[PDB]
Design a protein around this ligand. Structure first.
Ligand SMILES: [Zn+2]
Ligand SMILES: [Zn+2]
Length: 474
C-alpha cells in the first residue's frame, strides 16, 4: 500500500513532454507508480484535481551554503517549489576556510564568524547531522581555496600554492563535492591565470565533477571570457557550466544573439551547459565597476552605514557629492542590486534550448533581490503562461529533468517509478512570483505543496517541520 497517492491531476514528468492526466503514488522516499492508480491501495488519496504534479525544482545556482545550516526550513526556496539546491557557486563556497573576515564576495555567505569549517568534510558532516528541508549538491569554490592558501591574493599563485589548493580541491571532491567553481571576475581571483585555474581543477576528471563558472567578464570582453571557459573545459575534459549567462551594460545589449551562437557551436564539440535567472537586474557585492554602476543601483546592505539598506545609490552618491563609482570605497563592505541587463536578451537567453533555471539568490541580504523568492514561479507563470515564451512542460524541464542530467543527480528530476519523490503540486493557472523589488520576500502564489524524498516540507503555505533533505553526490 502506498503512503499516499496524489490523484486527479496532470503530470508533467520532467522529460519535456506535454502533461497527461495521471496519479502519482509514493511509498517511503520513492515514487512507486504513475498512471491510473485507482486500483492501488493507499493510506491517503490526495485530490489534486486542477493541479500539476511535477518533479521538485532543482535550483542550479544558489549561494545557500550557510543558509542551509542557519535556516534549515529554507523557506525562500521551498515556498517556490525548490527541492534541491546546488551550492558553492562563482568560486564562493563556505568551506574549506576558517577566517573571521573573509574577503568580498565571500562575505555574502557570512552571518558573523560563519567561516569555521577547516575541512570541506566538516561542512558536509554538519549538514548531515542537522539536515535542511531540501537536498544539497555542494561544490567547492576556487576563491575560497585561494583565501585559505594564499597570504596575498593580488597575484598569481605559486606552484606550491597551486599544489596546496589542488590538494584541498581533491579532498573536497573526495568527500562528496560535485564540482569546483570559479569567479575570476571578483577581487579574490582577478589575478588568477587560466593555467592556475586548470591545475587546481584537474582532480575533476578523477572524481568526475563539473567545472562551473562566473566568467571573468560578461560585457565588452565576454567573447574572450567565453573562449577561456571553453579552453578550460577542453584541457580538463569535464563538463563546464556557465553561470547566470547575460550580456551586461548598454554597449552590450542585443549581444545575446552572438554569445548564444558561440555557446551553441561549442556544444557541438565539447560538454557545455548554462543557467540564468529571469530578471534584468543582477546582484552581488558593492564594487567599483564602471559597468555595474552605470544604471540604477540599490544597496542591499552596508556594514559601515547600515541605514543605507534599501536606498538608491545615485541619491547617496549625489548627496555625498560624488559619482556612484567614486562613492563606493567609503561604503564598503556592502551589497547592491544592479539594473544592467535588457529584457530582450534575458528572454532570448531563457528561451535558448539548454538554458537551465538558477536563482542566484543571496539569502543573507537585508533587502534582497527578489530572485531569491520568485525565480521559479516567474518562469512557470509570467514567462511560460503569460508570455508564452515556451510551453509549460518545457519550462518545467528546464528546472527539473535538464538540470538533474547536467549536474548528475541520479534518480531525481523526473516523475518516474523508482525515482526519489521530490515533487511539487502547483496550479498552472495561478502559479506566480509575488516578490517584487519593492517587497522582495513575498511568498509565491499557486504552490500547493512540495515533497522532498517523499515527505511534505511545504503545505498550507508553511514549512511543515520535516528536515527531509539529503547531501547528494554526483
Ligand atoms: Zn552566483
Ligand atoms: Zn556569479
Amino acid at each position: 500500500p502506498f503512503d499516499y497517492i496524489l490523484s486527479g491531476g496532470t503530470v508533467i514528468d520532467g522529460t519535456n513532454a506535454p502533461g497527461r492526466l495521471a496519479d502519482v503514488g509514493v511509498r517511503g522516499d520513492r515514487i512507486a507508480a504513475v498512471g491510473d492508480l485507482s486500483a492501488s491501495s493507499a493510506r491517503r488519496r490526495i485530490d489534486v484535481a486542477g493541479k500539476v504534479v511535477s518533479p521538485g525544482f532543482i535550483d542550479s545556482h544558489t549561494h545557500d551554503d550557510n543558509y542551509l545550516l542557519k535556516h534549515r526550513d529554507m523557506t525562500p526556496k521551498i515556498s517556490q517549489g525548490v527541492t534541491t539546491v546546488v551550492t558553492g557557486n562563482c568560486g564562493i563556497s563556505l568551506a574549506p576556510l576558517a577566517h573571521a573576515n573573509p574577503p568580498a564576495p565571500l562575505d555574502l555567505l557570512d552571518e558573523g564568524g560563519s567561516f569555521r569549517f577547516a575541512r570541506f568534510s566538516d561542512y558536509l558532516e554538519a549538514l548531515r547531522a542537522a539536515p535542511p528541508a531540501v537536498n544539497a549538491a555542494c561544490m567547492v569554490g576556487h576563491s575560497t581555496l585561494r583565501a585559505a592558501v594564499m597570504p596575498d591574493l593580488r597575484r598569481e599563485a605559486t606552484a606550491d600554492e597551486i599544489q596546496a589548493m589542488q590538494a584541498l580541491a581533491d579532498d573536497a571532491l573526495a568527500s562528496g563535492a560535485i564540482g569546483i567553481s570559479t569567479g575570476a571576475f571578483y577581487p579574490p581571483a582577478a589575478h588568477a591565470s587560466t593555467e592556475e585555474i586548470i591545475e587546481v581543477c584537474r582532480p575533476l576528471i578523477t572524481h568526475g565533477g563539473v567545472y562551473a563558472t562566473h566568467m571573468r567578464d560578461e560585457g565588452e570582453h565576454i567573447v574572450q571570457a567565453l573562449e577561456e571557459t571553453f579552453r578550460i573545459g577542453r584541457e580538463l575534459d569535464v563538463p563546464v557550466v556557465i553561470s547566470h549567462h547575460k550580456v551586461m551594460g548598454k554597449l552590450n545589449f542585443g549581444r545575446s544573439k552572438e554569445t548564444l551562437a558561440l555557446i551553441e557551436a561549442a556544444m557541438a564539440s565539447q560538454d557545455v551547459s548554462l543557467d540564468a535567472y529571469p530578471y534584468v537586474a543582477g546582484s552581488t557585492m558593492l564594487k567599483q565597476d564602471r559597468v555595474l554602476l552605470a544604471g540604477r543601483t540599490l544597496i542591499t546592505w552596508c556594514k559601515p552605514y547600515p541605514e543605507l539598506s534599501g536606498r538608491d545609490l545615485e541619491e547617496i552618491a549625489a548627496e555625498r557629492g560624488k559619482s556612484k563609482y567614486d562613492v563606493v570605497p567609503e561604503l564598503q563592505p556592502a551589497g547592491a542590486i544592479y539594473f544592467m541587463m535588457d529584457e530582450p536578451d534575458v528572454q532570448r537567453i531563457l528561451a535558448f534550448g539548454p538554458t537551465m533555471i538558477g536563482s542566484a539568490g543571496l539569502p543573507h541580504d537585508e533587502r534582497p533581490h527578489p530572485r531569491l523568492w520568485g525565480t521559479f514561479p516567474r518562469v512557470l507563470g509570467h514567462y511560460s503562461r503569460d508570455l508564452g515564451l515556451f510551453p509549460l512542460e518545457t519550462a518545467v524541464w528546464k528546472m527539473t529533468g535538464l538540470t538533474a542530467a547536467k549536474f548528475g543527480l541520479a534518480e531525481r528530476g523526473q516523475v518516474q517509478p523508482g525515482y526519489y519523490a521530490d515533487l511539487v503540486v502547483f496550479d498552472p493557472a495561478t502559479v506566480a512570483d509575488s516578490a517584487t523589488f519593492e517587497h522582495p520576500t513575498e511568498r509565491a502564489a499557486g504552490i500547493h505543496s512540495v515533497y522532498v524524498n517523499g515527505a511534505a516540507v511545504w503545505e498550507d503555505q508553511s514549512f511543515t517541520g520535516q528536515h527531509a533533505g539529503r547531501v547528494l553526490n554526483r
